[PDB]
From Swiss-Prot, chain A:
This is Glutamate receptor ionotropic, NMDA 2A. Belongs to the glutamate-gated ion channel (TC 1.A.10.1) family. NR2A/GRIN2A subfamily. It is linked to Epilepsy, focal, with speech disorder and with or without impaired intellectual development: An autosomal dominant, highly variable neurologic disorder. Features range from severe early-onset seizures associated with delayed psychomotor development, persistent speech difficulties, and intellectual disability to a more benign entity characterized by childhood onset of mild or asymptomatic seizures associated with transient speech difficulties followed by remission of seizures in adolescence and normal psychomotor development. Component of N-methyl-D-aspartate (NMDA) receptors (NMDARs) that function as heterotetrameric, ligand-gated cation channels with high calcium permeability and voltage-dependent block by Mg(2+). NMDARs participate in synaptic plasticity for learning and memory formation by contributing to the slow phase of excitatory postsynaptic current, long-term synaptic potentiation, and learning. It comes from Homo sapiens (Human). Glycans are attached at residues 41-42. It comes from the Eukaryota. Changing residue 47 to E: Found in a cutaneous malignant melanoma sample; somatic mutation. Heterotetramer. Forms heterotetrameric channels composed of two GluN1/zeta subunits (GRIN1), and two identical GluN2/epsilon subunits (GRIN2A, GRIN2B, GRIN2C or GRIN2D) or GluN3 subunits (GRIN3A or GRIN3B) (in vitro). Can also form heterotetrameric channels that contain at least two GluN1 subunits and at least two different GluN2 subunits (or a combination of one GluN2 and one GluN3 subunits) (in vitro). In vivo, the subunit composition may depend on the expression levels of the different subunits. Found in a complex with GRIN1, GRIN3A and PPP2CB. Found in a complex with GRIN1 and GRIN3B. Contains an N-terminal domain, a ligand-binding domain and a transmembrane domain. Agonist binding to the extracellular ligand-binding domains triggers channel gating. A hydrophobic region that gives rise to the prediction of a transmembrane span does not cross the membrane, but is part of a discontinuously helical region that dips into the membrane and is probably part of the pore and of the selectivity filter. It is found in: Cell projection, Dendritic spine; Cell membrane; Synapse; Postsynaptic cell membrane. The gene is GRIN2A.
UniProtKB/Swiss-Prot annotation, chain B:
Component of N-methyl-D-aspartate (NMDA) receptors (NMDARs) that function as heterotetrameric, ligand-gated cation channels with high calcium permeability and voltage-dependent block by Mg(2+). NMDARs participate in synaptic plasticity for learning and memory formation by contributing to the long-term potentiation (LTP). Channel activation requires binding of the neurotransmitter L-glutamate to the GluN2 subunit, glycine or D-serine binding to the GluN1 subunit, plus membrane depolarization to eliminate channel inhibition by Mg(2+). NMDA is probably regulated by C-terminal phosphorylation of an isoform of GRIN1 by PKC. Its phosphorylated state is influenced by the formation of the NMDAR-PPP2CB complex and the NMDAR channel activity. It comes from Homo sapiens (Human). It is found in: Cell membrane; Postsynaptic cell membrane; Postsynaptic density membrane; Synaptic cell membrane. The chain holds residues 649 to 698 of 938 of the full protein. Changing residue 7 to Q: In NDHMSD; likely pathogenic; changed glutamate-gated calcium ion channel activity; mutant channels are activated at 10-fold lower glutamate concentrations and 13-fold lower glycine concentrations. Changing residue 2 to I: In NDHMSD; likely pathogenic; changed glutamate-gated calcium ion channel activity; mutant channels are activated at 100-fold lower glutamate concentrations and 30-fold lower glycine concentrations. Glycans are attached at residue 26. This is Glutamate receptor ionotropic, NMDA 1. The gene is GRIN1. Glycine binds at residue 40. Changing residue 5 to G: Increase in glutamate and glycine agonist potency; mutant channels are activated lower glutamate and glycine concentrations.
Length: 50, 50
């Protein structure tokens, strides 16, 4: 059980999620991979793991 | 008393004390400051955890 999921919010000045820069780099340095369900349409609830 | 207080509490030349100065922390548009080029200042800024 070495892989455990962690869930976090972005309502406080302690966790901030930013889009990865389109310069073949993974958020430069000092970052942790994250997942967020980005809604596509006002009806469909499908979210890509960006 | 008013003259003495307003003379000893005039405008101070102290505008910054170091990297930990709160006035340096805020990137407000009122106070604009930046490095000249990509010199070692840029590397030091990039090599900071926060």
């Amino acid at each position: 059980d070495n892989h455990l999921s962690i869930v976090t919010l972005e309502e406080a000045p302690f966790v901030i999620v930013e889009d990865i820069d389109p310069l073949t780099e993974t958020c430069v340095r000092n970052t942790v991979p994250c997942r967020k369900f980005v809604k596509i349409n006002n009806s469909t609830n499908e979210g890509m793991n960006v | 008393a008013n003259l003495a207080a307003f003379l000893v509490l005039d405008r101070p030349e102290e505008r910054i004390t170091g990297i930990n100065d709160p006035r340096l922390r805020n990137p407000s548009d009122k106070f604009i400051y930046a490095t000249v080029k990509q010199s070692s200042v840029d590397i030091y800024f990039r090599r900071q955890v926060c």
